[PDB]
RNA sequence: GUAAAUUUAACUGUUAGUCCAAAGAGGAACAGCUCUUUGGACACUAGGAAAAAACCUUGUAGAGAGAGUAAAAAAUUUAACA
């Protein structure tokens, strides 16, 4: 590259601000890819001692989607250590109280359990809705693609495809429906 | 008229991955010929600089360049400062082109020239074995022989 | 019309096989950023313009929180270390290339 | 002189001045600096890749922590390319 | 050396990734064809004796 | 004359890259006018 | 209601309904037949 | 197919034993229970089953910033009846 040594080092080890969207995405897949980016495992110069994490800015965290009945099954447990500090809240209740807590907890769980985890969480940025602070928006690079594909409700189908899909059966003329 | 086997377009009527069609063999072969000729004329003209190679040596694979140093973990039956030819070149490349062996490139195509410049010993290595409550304790000190080779030159020839 | 990978971010990769079939030739010239894809470079009447040299001394706490906010870290990196570690550090480290 | 950079051996002050002089003396339009790549910008650790173009043709690129130092580095890269003392150049023949 | 190329020789590594992707596509094509179509340009095996 | 002590990295090259050392913007596509994600322009 | 593992119809007016994820035997004429799957 | 065996000479040390599989006995067709037999392993290495004696993979010793593998990750969601 014929760069000078110091600018070359700076370019190689610079931090990148990635953008990620919630909005009908699974918190787990969001957390997996965000954790990869935060650890810096996506870089080929990666090493645990090289401090090569990147900033991850996740938005619409209020609009995540859980598969199955996870909203009512999944229980988050904590303990304020005073006798009886054991609290357990379903995913619905936790989401209602804090709109970013679920994604934050998922990323925290997926991060490696060492002393760099809190630094990585410090580089992670979460926002419940469309609004993003201007400095962060001016820092952003590379909105990453969403893991899920948003299956496109029936009323969102166009007439061309509606009529291109064949009709499967012939109803009787005398059925009330 | 629907063909006997037509599936209406559903989410999983077709594989999720995109359909890929490979180039036809004849046109593709002529394309390979043109590409190889272009790289060959690049080599003939000399439109390259600072070659690098991946070379098999002493059971190891080394990515070397000219003016390089490597440390081989054994003696090599060579006097100091002796020029030898490294031959088992898995890969040679430069900017804008690289040549891949299957698995080795022809010796008419590339030469690696190196020079034995040092014959030394490693720093002492400690082998200590210990098993507790059984009085088990052994200590050994070893010094593996070593050879420092300087990669002098990587040369390619027009032979594609 | 078939390319193994998208051909627009690092280099224009062209794979080839020699006639004998014994070696593979790869042609990879760099891809240059388009000028169109770039972006332009961003841009007291009576007295001296006295240089505005104020340096408020922050006590250790608020100081460390300001540094941690600035660099997106925690406070532990900024808290100091003892003489044992300070002397154990190598002040003449080996330096290759 | 084996393994050092051109501007590590021969110190220069204004690479942009030297570069524009060389382009003028070989009849090339003056280079235009543009922000090819940018990361951060509001933080304390930004990355700026500034490219030098001539007639809308990229002649050089350089990274930096500030736009000005990135532009200076791009000027140095252009000088290295023009004088041929580049990193990937053909090594010396002994 | 694969990691060394990924870090220091990015264009060569992209060439390698392209070759591997092409070999994977040729494998998919042969598997779907299931007949006796030509083996494929980069699927050819150099034999030693 | 060098010391017989531990030698890191049993290879020493001074020109480790010829195609340019990897930086995060290698293998990264450029965009129209270099617009940032979700930029209102 | 009485908790049962095996629900049985004791009347011809008894009917099985699955509510709240559990099966129930409801009888409007003989409310003593109310049964809850456990 | 293999390379050990028997004898002669000279002695020490071990002779308070555990799990697993199998055939039994006692006991509750209890026990990380007790008692025999056959065979492993442990009382020696390394990998796996979360940690790990006894389960599974593997043995003969060093250096290597190479490579091929062994064992090796649990699956399941149920009640209409003329
Ligand atoms: Mg017992
Ligand atoms: Mg062995
Ligand atoms: Zn009833």
Ligand nearest, relative to CA of residue G27: 3
Ligand 3 (single-atom ion) residues, CB below 5 Å: G 10-11, 14, 27, 30, 33
Of all residues in chain F, the one with the smallest CA distance to A9 is F23
* Spatial CA neighbour of C4 closest among B27, B39, E30, E16: E16
For B157, the 3-state DSSP assignment is: coil
Residue B147's contacts (CB-CB under 8 Å, 6 or more residues apart) are B71, B72, B74, B75, B76, B78, B116, B118, B119, B120
φ/ψ of B23, rounded to 5, equals -65, 150
Does any CB of chain E come closer than 8 Å to the CB of residue A45? yes
Tokens 């991955």, residue located? B17
Q: Which nucleotide is nearest to B131 (CA to C1')?
A: H44
Burial of D70 (0-12, 13-18, 19+ CB in 10 A): buried
* Spatial CA neighbour of B158 closest among B49, B34, B35, B45: B45
Q: Compute the Cα dihedral for D7, D12, D13, D16 and give only its sign.
A: negative
Enter the tokens of residue C81.
């270390």
Rounded CA-CA distance G38/G1 in Å is 11
Rounded CA-CA distance B121/C38 in Å is 55
Tokens 């770039």, residue located? C38
Indicate the residue of E5, E11, E41 with minimum beta-carbon distance to B25.
E41
DSSP C35-85: GGGS-BPP---SS------------HHHHHHHHHHHHT--STTTS---HHH
Residues A111 and D15: beta-carbon distance below 8 Å: no
The answer to whether the Cβ–Cβ distance between D34 and C35 falls below 8 Å is yes
Name the experiment that determined this structure.
cryo-EM
Of all residues in chain D, the one with the smallest CA distance to B47 is D90
Enter the tokens of residue B153.
């030159």
C-alpha G10 – ligand 1 centre gap (Å): 56
Residues C16 and B39: beta-carbon distance below 8 Å: yes
Indicate the residue of A2, A7, A139 with minimum beta-carbon distance to D43.
A139
Residue A146's contacts (CB-CB under 8 Å, 6 or more residues apart) are A20, A21, A23, A25
- Residue D38 burial (CB count, 10 A): 21
CA angle (B119 as vertex; B114, B123 as ends), nearest 5: 125
Q: Which nucleotide is nearest to G9 (CA to C1')?
A: H79
Spell out the alpha helix ranges (H) of A98-158. 101-110, 117-123, 134-139
Residues A58 and A30: beta-carbon distance below 8 Å: yes
Indicate the residue of D3, D49, D88 with minimum beta-carbon distance to F14.
D3
Residue A99 C-alpha, separation from nearest chain F C-alpha, in angstroms: 22
CA–C1' D1–H19 (A): 72
The answer to whether the Cβ–Cβ distance between D39 and A10 falls below 8 Å is no
Tokens 């104020």, residue located? C54
φ/ψ of C88, rounded to 5, equals -70, -25
Residue E42 C-alpha, separation from nearest chain B C-alpha, in angstroms: 11
CA distances from B132 to B126, B128, B137, B139, B141 (A): 19, 13, 9, 15, 21
Residue A37 C-alpha, separation from nearest chain E C-alpha, in angstroms: 18
**Which residues are paired to G26 by β-bridges?**
G15
DSSP B70-139: EEESS--S--TTEEEEE--EEEEEETEEEEEESSS--TTTEEEEEEEEEEEEPPPEEEEEEETTTTEEEE
Does any CB of chain F come closer than 8 Å to the CB of residue E16? no
**Residues in A touching C68 (Cβ below 8 Å):** 122
Enter the tokens of residue F2.
């060098």
Q: Compute the Cα dihedral for G8, G13, G18, G20 and give only its sign.
A: negative
C-alpha G34 – ligand 3 centre gap (Å): 7
C-alpha B121 – ligand 2 centre gap (Å): 26
B25: left (phi over 0), alpha (psi -120 to 50) or beta: alpha
**Residues in C touching A118 (Cβ below 8 Å):** 74
Residues B121 and F5: beta-carbon distance below 8 Å: no
Indicate the residue of C2, C23, C30 with minimum beta-carbon distance to B23.
C2
* Spatial CA neighbour of D46 closest among D74, D66, D72, D71: D66
Rounded CA-CA distance B89/B107 in Å is 8
Domains of chain A: 1-177 (3.90.1180.10)
Q: Which nucleotide is nearest to B144 (CA to C1')?
A: H63
The answer to whether the Cβ–Cβ distance between C23 and B97 falls below 8 Å is no
Residue A163's contacts (CB-CB under 8 Å, 6 or more residues apart) are none
């Amino acid at each position: 590259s014929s760069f000078s040594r110091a600018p070359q080092q700076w370019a190689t080890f610079a931090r990148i601000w990635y953008l990620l969207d919630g909005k009908m995405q699974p918190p787990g897949k969001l957390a997996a890819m965000a954790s990869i980016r935060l650890q810096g495992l996506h870089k080929p110069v990666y090493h645990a001692l090289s401090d090569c994490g990147d900033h991850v800015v996740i938005m619409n965290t209020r609009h995540i989607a859980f598969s199955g009945n996870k909203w009512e099954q999944k229980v988050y447990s904590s303990h304020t250590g005073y006798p009886g500090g054991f609290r357990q809240v379903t995913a619905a209740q936790l989401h209602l109280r804090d709109p970013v807590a679920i994604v934050k907890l998922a990323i925290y769980g997926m991060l490696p359990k060492n002393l760099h985890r809190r630094t990585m969480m410090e580089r992670l940025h979460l926002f419940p809705d469309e609004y993003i602070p201007e400095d962060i928006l001016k820092n952003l690079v590379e909105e990453l693609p969403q893991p899920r594909k948003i299956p496109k409700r029936l009323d969102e189908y166009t007439q061309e495809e509606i009529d291109a899909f064949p009709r499967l059966w012939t109803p009787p003329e005398d059925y009330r429906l | 008229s629907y063909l006997p086997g037509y599936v209406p377009k559903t989410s999983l009527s077709s594989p999720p991955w995109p359909e890929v069609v490979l180039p036809d063999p004849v046109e593709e072969t002529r394309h390979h010929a043109e590409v190889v000729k272009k790289v060959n004329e690049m080599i003939v003209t000399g439109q390259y600089g600072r070659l690098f190679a991946v070379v098999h040596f002493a059971s190891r694979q080394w990515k070397v360049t000219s003016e390089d140093l490597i440390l081989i973990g054994n003696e090599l039956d060579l006097a100091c400062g002796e020029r030898i030819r490294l031959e088992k070149v898995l890969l040679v490349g430069a900017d804008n082109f690289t040549l891949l062996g299957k698995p080795l490139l022809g010796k008419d195509l590339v030469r690696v020239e190196a020079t034995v410049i040092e014959k030394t010993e490693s720093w002492p290595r400690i082998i200590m074995r210990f098993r507790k409550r059984k009085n088990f304790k052994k200590k050994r000190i070893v010094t593996t022989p070593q050879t420092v080779l300087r990669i002098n030159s990587i040369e390619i020839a027009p032979c594609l | 019309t078939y390319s193994p990978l998208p051909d627009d971010y690092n280099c224009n990769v062209e794979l080839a096989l020699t006639s004998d079939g014994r070696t593979i030739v790869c042609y990879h010239p760099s891809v240059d950023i388009p000028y169109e894809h770039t972006k332009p470079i961003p841009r007291d009447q009576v007295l001296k313009t006295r240089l505005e040299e104020k340096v408020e001394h922050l006590e250790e706490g608020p100081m460390i929180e300001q540094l941690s906010k600035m660099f997106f870290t925690t406070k532990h990196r900024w808290y100091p270390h003892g003489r044992y570690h300070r002397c154990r550090k190598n002040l003449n480290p080996p330096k290759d290339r | 002189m084996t393994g050092k950079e051109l501007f590590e051996m021969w110190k220069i002050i204004n690479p942009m001045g030297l570069l524009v002089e060389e382009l003028k003396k070989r009849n090339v339009s003056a280079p235009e600096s543009r922000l090819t790549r940018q990361s951060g910008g509001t933080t304390a650790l930004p990355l700026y890749f500034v490219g030098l173009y001539c007639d809308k043709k990229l002649i050089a690129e350089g990274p930096g922590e500030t736009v000005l130092v990135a532009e200076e580095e791009a000027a140095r890269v252009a000088l290295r390319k023009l004088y041929g003392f580049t990193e990937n150049r053909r090594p010396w023949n002994y | 050396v694969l990691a060394d190329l990924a870090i220091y020789e990015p264009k060569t590594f992209k060439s390698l990734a392209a070759l591997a992707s092409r070999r994977r596509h040729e494998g998919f094509a042969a598997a779907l064809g299931d007949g006796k179509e030509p083996e494929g340009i980069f699927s050819r095996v150099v034999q030693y004796h | 004359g060098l010391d017989v002590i531990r030698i890191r990295k049993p290879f020493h090259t001074d020109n480790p890259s010829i195609q340019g050392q990897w930086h995060p913007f290698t293998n990264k596509p450029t965009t129209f006018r270099g617009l940032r994600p979700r930029e209102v322009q | 209601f009485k908790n049962k593992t095996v629900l049985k119809k004791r009347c011809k007016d008894c009917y099985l309904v699955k509510r709240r994820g559990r099966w129930y035997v409801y009888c409007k004429t003989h409310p003593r037949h109310k049964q809850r799957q456990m």
